[PDB]
Amino acid sequence: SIQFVDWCPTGFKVGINYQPPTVVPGGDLAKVQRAVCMLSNTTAIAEAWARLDHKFDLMYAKRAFVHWYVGEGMEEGEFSEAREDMAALEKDYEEVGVDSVEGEGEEEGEEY
Amino acid sequence: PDLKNVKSKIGSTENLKHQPGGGKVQIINKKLDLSNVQSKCGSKDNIK
């Protein structure tokens, strides 16, 4: 229920270091004996790509602000080709979140 | 006496040709071209 992709054979990377966590001077802080530090790779970043896809297109269509980038050395095609890359990234992250099942084209009849 | 003709000097009587006239405004909008674009990862054809 804590959800991995269908295709995942092996999803983990584990480590052990003997030195503890140590805080700073100058707080009411927790001097714990042990800690974890985690990094998650996930399609959930594709929700915040979709927000950059939303923010961008309202400004860039109206061409708000773009003259500030022009006047300090930048192509217009630069913005366009960065958002093009975001149009790819949106899908680069969608071609993964899918389940590993196989097949192609079109059919409407029986084999059996 | 007689004055024959006399008139005012100078104001709104000398302005009656020049309104002035107005103009027209426009946006301030574009698109971008998407026609070149494909995804940059791409393993699913390897099913072959």
Q: Say how far apart CA A53 and CA A3 lie, in whole Å.
A: 25
Q: Say how far apart CA A40 and CA A44 lie, in whole Å.
A: 10
3-state secondary structure of A50: helix
Q: Say how far apart CA A31 and CA A24 lie, in whole Å.
A: 10
CATH of region A45-102: 1.10.287.600
Phi, psi (degrees; rounded to nearest 5) at A103: 145, 155
Which of B31, B1, B44, B16 is closest to A102 using CA atoms? B44
Q: Say how far apart CA A34 and CA A22 lie, in whole Å.
A: 10
CA of A84 vs chain B CAs: smallest distance (Å)? 7
Q: Say how far apart CA A87 and CA A93 lie, in whole Å.
A: 10
| End-to-end Cα separation, chain B, in angstroms | 116
Q: Is A61 on the interface with B (CB under 8 A)?
A: yes
Cβ distance B46 to A98 under 8 Å? no
Alpha-helical regions (H) of A1-112? 45-61, 67-70, 76-92, 94-97
Of B27, B36, B44, nearest to A95 by CB-CB distance is: B44
Q: Is A47 on the interface with B (CB under 8 A)?
A: no
**DSSP single-letter state for residue B13:** G
* Six token digits for residue B45: 């054809």
3-state secondary structure of A48: helix
**A95 neighbourhood in chain B, CB within 8 Å:** 39, 41-44
Type of residue found at A102: E
